[PDB]
């Protein structure tokens, strides 16, 4: 039913068009930390805990 | 009655005059045409139709 067919004298019969689309992405930030004291390092039995 | 006679004395008698006429003509334009298609030539049984 939807085939493009011409005739003997054909003009302005079969017009077509085009389309484009877009994609996107984003970035985020992460992080974490820990704390300690001087006594914890100095008086601990295990050196090199750091 | 209207002959140009003179007398021995002469004088300002028997004066005449002249005239001219003008004629004219103009031009015009004509034309005609015809149309055809490609399949009318390609698929017709008789070559040399044009």
Swiss-Prot record, chains A, B:
Signal sequence coordinates: none
Location of this chain's protein in the cell: Virion
Source superkingdom: Viruses
Functional description taken from the UniProt entry: Assembles, to form an icosahedral capsid with a T=9 symmetry, about 60 nm in diameter, and consisting of 535 capsid proteins.
Name this polypeptide is given: Major capsid protein
Name of the gene encoding the protein in the UniProt record: 56
């Amino acid at each position: 039913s939807k085939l493009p067919l011409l005739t003997e004298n054909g003009g302005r019969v079969n017009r077509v068009g085009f389309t484009r689309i877009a994609r996107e992405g984003s970035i985020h930030k992460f992080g974490f930390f820990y704390e300690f004291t001087q006594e914890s390092i100095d008086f601990d039995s295990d050196d090199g805990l750091m």
